[PDB]
Short mmCIF file of C-alpha atoms and ligand atoms in Angstrom, two decimals:
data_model
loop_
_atom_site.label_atom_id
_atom_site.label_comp_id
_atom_site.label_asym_id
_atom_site.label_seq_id
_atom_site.Cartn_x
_atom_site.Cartn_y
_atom_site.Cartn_z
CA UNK A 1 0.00 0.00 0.00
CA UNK A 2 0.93 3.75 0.05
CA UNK A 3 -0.11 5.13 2.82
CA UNK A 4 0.19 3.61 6.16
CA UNK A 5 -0.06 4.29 9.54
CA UNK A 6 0.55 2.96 13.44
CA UNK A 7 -0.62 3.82 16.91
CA UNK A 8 1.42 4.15 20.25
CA UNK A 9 -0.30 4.48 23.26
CA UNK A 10 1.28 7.28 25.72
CA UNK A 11 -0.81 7.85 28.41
CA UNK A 12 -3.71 5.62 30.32
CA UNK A 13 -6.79 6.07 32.02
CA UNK A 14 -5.51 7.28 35.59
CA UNK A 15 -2.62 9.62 34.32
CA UNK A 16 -5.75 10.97 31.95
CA UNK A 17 -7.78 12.32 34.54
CA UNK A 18 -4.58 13.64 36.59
CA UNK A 19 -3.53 15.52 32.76
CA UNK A 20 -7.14 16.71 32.69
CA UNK A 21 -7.01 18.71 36.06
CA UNK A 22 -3.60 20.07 36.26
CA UNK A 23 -3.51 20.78 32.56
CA UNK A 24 0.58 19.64 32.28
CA UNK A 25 1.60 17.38 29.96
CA UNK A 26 5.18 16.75 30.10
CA UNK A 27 4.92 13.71 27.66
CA UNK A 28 7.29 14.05 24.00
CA UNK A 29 4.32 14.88 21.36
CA UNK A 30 5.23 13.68 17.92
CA UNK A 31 3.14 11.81 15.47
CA UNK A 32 0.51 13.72 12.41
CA UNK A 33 -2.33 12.85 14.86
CA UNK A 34 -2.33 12.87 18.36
CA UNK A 35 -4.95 10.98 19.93
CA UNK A 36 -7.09 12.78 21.99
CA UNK A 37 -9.50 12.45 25.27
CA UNK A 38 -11.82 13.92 27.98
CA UNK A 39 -13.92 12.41 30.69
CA UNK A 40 -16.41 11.18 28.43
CA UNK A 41 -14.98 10.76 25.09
CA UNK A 42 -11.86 10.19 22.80
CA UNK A 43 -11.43 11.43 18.98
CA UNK A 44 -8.07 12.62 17.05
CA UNK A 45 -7.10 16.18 15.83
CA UNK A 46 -4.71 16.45 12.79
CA UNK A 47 -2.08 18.55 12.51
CA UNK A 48 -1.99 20.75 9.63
CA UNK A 49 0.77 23.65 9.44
CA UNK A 50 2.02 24.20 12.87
CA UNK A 51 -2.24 23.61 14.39
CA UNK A 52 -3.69 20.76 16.19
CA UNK A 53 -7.11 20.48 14.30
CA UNK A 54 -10.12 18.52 15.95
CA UNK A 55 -13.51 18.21 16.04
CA UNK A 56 -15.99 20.95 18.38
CA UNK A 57 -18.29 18.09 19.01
CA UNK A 58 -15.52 16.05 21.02
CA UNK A 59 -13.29 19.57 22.26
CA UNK A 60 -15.79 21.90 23.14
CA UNK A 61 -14.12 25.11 24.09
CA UNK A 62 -11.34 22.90 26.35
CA UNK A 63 -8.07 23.75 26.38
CA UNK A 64 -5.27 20.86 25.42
CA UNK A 65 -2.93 19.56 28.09
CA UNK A 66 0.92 20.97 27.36
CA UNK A 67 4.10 20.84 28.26
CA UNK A 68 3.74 24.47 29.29
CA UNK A 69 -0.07 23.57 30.75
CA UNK A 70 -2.82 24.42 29.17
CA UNK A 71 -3.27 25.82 25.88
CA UNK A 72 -6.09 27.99 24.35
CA UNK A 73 -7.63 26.92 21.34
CA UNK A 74 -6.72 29.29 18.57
CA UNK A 75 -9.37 29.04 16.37
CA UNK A 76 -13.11 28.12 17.22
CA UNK A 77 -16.21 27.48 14.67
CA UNK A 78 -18.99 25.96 15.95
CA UNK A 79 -21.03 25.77 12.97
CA UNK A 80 -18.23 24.54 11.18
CA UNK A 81 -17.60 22.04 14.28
CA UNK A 82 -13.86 22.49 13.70
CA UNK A 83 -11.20 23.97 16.48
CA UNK A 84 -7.83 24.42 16.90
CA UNK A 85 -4.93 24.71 19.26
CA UNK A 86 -1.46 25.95 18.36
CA UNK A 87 0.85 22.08 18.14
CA UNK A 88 3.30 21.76 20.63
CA UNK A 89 6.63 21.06 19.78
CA UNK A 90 6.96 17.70 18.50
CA UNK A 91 3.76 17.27 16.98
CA UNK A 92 4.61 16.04 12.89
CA UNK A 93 3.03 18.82 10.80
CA UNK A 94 1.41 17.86 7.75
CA UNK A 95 0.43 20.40 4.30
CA UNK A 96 -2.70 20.81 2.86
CA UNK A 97 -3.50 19.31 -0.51
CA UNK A 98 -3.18 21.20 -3.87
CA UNK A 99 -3.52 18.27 -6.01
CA UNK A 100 -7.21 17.86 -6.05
CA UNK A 101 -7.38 14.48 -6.30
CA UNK A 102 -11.02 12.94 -5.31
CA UNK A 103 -9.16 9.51 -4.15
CA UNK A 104 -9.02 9.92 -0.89
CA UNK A 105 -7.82 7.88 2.36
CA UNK A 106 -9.68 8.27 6.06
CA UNK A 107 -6.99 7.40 8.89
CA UNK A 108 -8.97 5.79 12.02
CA UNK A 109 -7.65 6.08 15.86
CA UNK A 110 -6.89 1.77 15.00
CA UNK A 111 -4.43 3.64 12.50
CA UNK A 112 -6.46 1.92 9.93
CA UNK A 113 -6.05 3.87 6.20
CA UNK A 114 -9.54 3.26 4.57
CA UNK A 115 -10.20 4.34 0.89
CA UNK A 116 -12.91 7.18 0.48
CA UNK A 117 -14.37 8.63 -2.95
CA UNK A 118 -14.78 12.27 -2.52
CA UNK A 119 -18.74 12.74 -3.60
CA UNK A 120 -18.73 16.77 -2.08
CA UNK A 121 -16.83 19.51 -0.68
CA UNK A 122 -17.73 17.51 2.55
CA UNK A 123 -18.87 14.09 1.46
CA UNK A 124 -17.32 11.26 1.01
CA UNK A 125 -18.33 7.41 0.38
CA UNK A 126 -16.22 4.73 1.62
CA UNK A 127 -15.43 2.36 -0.99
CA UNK A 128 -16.16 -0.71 1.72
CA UNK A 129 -18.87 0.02 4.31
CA UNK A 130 -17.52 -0.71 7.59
CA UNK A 131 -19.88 -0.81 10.96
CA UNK A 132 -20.41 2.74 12.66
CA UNK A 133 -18.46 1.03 15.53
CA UNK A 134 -14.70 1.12 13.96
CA UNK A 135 -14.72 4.88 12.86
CA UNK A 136 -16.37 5.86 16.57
CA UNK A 137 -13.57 7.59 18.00
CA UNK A 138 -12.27 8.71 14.84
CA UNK A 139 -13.43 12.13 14.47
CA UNK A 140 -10.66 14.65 13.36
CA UNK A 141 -8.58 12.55 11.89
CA UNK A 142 -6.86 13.45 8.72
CA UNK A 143 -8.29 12.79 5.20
CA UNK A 144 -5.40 12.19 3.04
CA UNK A 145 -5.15 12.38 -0.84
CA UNK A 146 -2.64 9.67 -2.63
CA UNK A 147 0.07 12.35 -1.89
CA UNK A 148 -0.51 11.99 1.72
CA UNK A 149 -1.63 15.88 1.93
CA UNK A 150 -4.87 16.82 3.87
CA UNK A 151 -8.17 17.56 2.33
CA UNK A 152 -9.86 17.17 5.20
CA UNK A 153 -10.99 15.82 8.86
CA UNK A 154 -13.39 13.58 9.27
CA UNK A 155 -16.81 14.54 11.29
CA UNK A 156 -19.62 12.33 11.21
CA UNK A 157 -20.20 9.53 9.74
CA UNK A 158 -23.79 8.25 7.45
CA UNK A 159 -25.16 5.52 8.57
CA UNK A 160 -28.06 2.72 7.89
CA UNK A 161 -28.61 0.20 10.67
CA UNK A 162 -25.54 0.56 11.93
CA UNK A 163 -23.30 0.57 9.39
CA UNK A 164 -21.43 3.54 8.04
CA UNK A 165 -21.58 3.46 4.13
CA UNK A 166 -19.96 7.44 3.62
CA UNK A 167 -18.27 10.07 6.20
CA UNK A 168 -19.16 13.91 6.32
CA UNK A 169 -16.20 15.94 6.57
CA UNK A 170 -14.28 19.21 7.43
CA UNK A 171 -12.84 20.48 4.17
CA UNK A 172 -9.54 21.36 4.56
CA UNK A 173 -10.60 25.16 3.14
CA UNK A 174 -12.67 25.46 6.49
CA UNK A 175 -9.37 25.80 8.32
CA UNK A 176 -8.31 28.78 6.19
CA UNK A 177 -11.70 30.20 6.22
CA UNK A 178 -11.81 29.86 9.93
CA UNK A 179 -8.02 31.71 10.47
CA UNK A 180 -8.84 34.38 7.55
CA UNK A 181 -12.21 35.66 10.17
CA UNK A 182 -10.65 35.40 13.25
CA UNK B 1 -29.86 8.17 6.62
CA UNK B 2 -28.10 8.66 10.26
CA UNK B 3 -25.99 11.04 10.87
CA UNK B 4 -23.35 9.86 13.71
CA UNK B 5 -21.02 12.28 15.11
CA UNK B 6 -17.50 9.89 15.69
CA UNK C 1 -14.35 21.68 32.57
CA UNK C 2 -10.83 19.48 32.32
CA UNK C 3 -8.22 19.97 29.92
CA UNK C 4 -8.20 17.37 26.44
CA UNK C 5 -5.49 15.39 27.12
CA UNK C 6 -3.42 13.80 24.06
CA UNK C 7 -3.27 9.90 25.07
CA UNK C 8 -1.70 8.28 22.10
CA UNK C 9 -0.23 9.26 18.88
CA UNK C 10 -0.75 8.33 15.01
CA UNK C 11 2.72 7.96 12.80
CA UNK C 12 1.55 7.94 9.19
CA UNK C 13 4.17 6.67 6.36
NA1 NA D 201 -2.04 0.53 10.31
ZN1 ZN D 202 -3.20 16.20 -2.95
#
């Protein structure tokens, strides 16, 4: 294959909740994607030119856990459901796609690289349905053209009984959009 | 069709 | 209202 991917685990469920209150993180960062979690939840953010990008619907307005403590988010859309912290150092930056290629690859928090037809601006099919189940966690992670540049992040996925059969996502113009207005 | 946050 | 904590990271090739 082209693009692949793996996963290594930093951090686990007690030394979580202590990096939740105290906002430190003294853990190396490096990686495209960090893996992300609160209390309730866990999703990805991608980052794309020297910003950790995520989804609002797993972020909120919560600041990420840093070597320095917390940090601010940057950039906030809710409609757009996209926000942004400034990537601490380590974090493996990644460039936006010029190419405009509509084959596209979805990387999952199982570092799984599954193929996507771009259908929309935001709208992709996946060229296998896979259960809702293996993307659930997934949110904000990066989709990649054959180049291995973003086009987007992935939001939400479309769904019948259960199974996910094509993924709604954050256009990789929404970032720029979002840092042009603020 | 459902749309589910992930 | 806790911090998002990064927990694991994603190393593409
Ligand atoms: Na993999
Ligand atoms: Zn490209």
């Amino acid at each position: 294959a082209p693009i692949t991917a793996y996963s290594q685990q930093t951090r686990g469920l007690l030394g979580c909740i202590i990096t939740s209150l105290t906002g430190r993180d003294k853990n190396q960062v490096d990686g495209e994607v960090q893996v992300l979690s609160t209390a309730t939840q866990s999703f990805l953010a991608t980052c794309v030119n020297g910003v950790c990008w995520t989804v609002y619907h797993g972020a909120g307005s919560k600041t990420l856990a840093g070597p320095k403590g917390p940090i601010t988010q940057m950039y906030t859309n809710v409609d757009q459901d996209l926000v942004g912290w400034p990537a601490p150092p380590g974090a493996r930056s990644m460039t936006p796609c010029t190419c405009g290629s509509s084959d596209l690859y979805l990387v999952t928090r199982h570092a799984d690289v599954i193929p996507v037809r771009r259908r929309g601006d935001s709208r992709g099919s996946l060229l296998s349905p896979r259960p809702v189940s293996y993307l659930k966690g997934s949110s904000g992670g990066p989709l990649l053209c054959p180049s291995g540049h973003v086009v987007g992040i992935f939001r939400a996925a479309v769904c019948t009984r259960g199974v996910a059969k094509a993924v709604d996502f954050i256009p990789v113009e929404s970032m720029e959009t979002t840092m042009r207005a603020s | 069709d459902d749309i589910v946050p992930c | 209202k806790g911090s998002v904590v990064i927990v694991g990271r994603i190393i593409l090739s």
